[PDB]
Amino acid sequence: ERVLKVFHYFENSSEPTTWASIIRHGDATDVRGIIQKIVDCHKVKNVACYGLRLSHLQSEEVHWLHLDMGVSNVREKFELAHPPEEWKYELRIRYLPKGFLNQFTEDKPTLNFFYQQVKNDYMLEIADQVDQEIALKLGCLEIRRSYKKSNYEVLEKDVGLRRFFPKSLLDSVAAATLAALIQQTFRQFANLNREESILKFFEILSPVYRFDKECFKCALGSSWIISVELAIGPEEGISYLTDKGANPTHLADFNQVQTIQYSNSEDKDRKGMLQLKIAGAPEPLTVTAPSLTIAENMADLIDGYCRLVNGATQSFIIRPDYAEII
């Protein structure tokens, strides 16, 4: 047999970075299998929001693995390129329900998985470059949820304030001001249960960090190709941004998607074509991605919402078994 290490975001009260699961598969087991086996352990309801992303520790390229793919195969293919240690597999939420948050409230593990997941990308992307008042509050919402000076001393010596706050904040604020700041911030969130916390966490982040969509610089049209930035998400579905400051312009709700079809661009250039039949409209929507990988990642993303919006486990892509947890 063969084994696979999968990182995820289910809180197992250890070090945040090292939450993973180790699961055995076979020549037959697919991606849908692996994912499910994991989400079942944690009694997840919103099963269809999870996807499996393969990131290369050495570079930026990410490959989102489609559900009906063989683990042995996909695993094999990428090992011809690079050795097993250089790759990393992570379970993530990628396909958000129309009213996701409100919906996650009824599925705790997924609420928390999403909380941990986002918070992580936050500490990794915008924490250091956003308003102090925003950093504070967020940081404090973690401590609050996760849990006099006789308590603050333990935070810096024994716990480490770096876990909750960006070092851009920590070196720009004196220790006493922060102790004072916390108490007063932590004050107004002082009667919010873990749930109201988490929500409040997002309430505060969303107007500054966009985590309810994914954007893709790519081009539209078939005969006259125009460069844009697609915006796939649950509110807008499929849209293009004029200014990042202006709201996205709509193109299609996922329920209109009839088929998703992808190839390379017919020439030496390895740009990626992605063509979608959309109900009611005559001419298909033709996306040209910088590369086939970027195309795969969009097709995946789009397909995911269709499987979600409609209740179907089967895929919209036109295309030319035992998992054990240990």
The CA distance from 132 to 237, in Å, is 32
> What type of residue sits at position 13?
S
> What type of residue sits at position 160?
G
The CA distance from 169 to 177, in Å, is 11
As given in the structure block, the two tokens for residue 241 are 């941004």
Q: Which CATH number fits domain 96-210: 3.40.50.620, 3.10.450.50, 3.40.50.1000, 1.20.80.10?
A: 1.20.80.10
CA angle 269, 275, 278 (to 5 degrees): 165
What Cα–Cα distance (Å) separates residue 56 from each residue in 60, 77, 290, 301? 7, 14, 19, 19
User: Bridge partners of 263?
Assistant: 273
User: Bridge partners of 276?
Assistant: 260, 285
CA 291 to the chain's CA centroid: 21
Find out whether 287 and 263 touch, Cβ atoms under 8 Å: no
Burial zone of 27 (CB within 10 Å; 0-12 exposed, 13-18 middle, 19+ buried): exposed
> What type of residue sits at position 274?
L
The CA distance from 242 to 263, in Å, is 27
DSSP class of residue 129 equals G
As given in the structure block, the two tokens for residue 240 are 């293009």
| Among candidate residues 315, 276, 297, 255, the one with its CA nearest the CA of residue 67 | 315
Helix (H) or strand (E) holding 110: helix 108-125
Resolution of this structure in Å: 3.2
The CA distance from 20 to 32, in Å, is 18
Could you tell me the residue ranges of all domains in the chain?
1-95, 96-210, 211-326
CATH 2.30.29.30 given to domain 211-326: yes
Give the count of alpha carbons within 13 A of 97, CB side only: 18
Listed in sequence order, the DSSP H helices in 30-90 are: 31-41, 71-79
Find out whether 326 and 23 touch, Cβ atoms under 8 Å: yes
CATH 3.30.420.40 given to domain 1-95: no
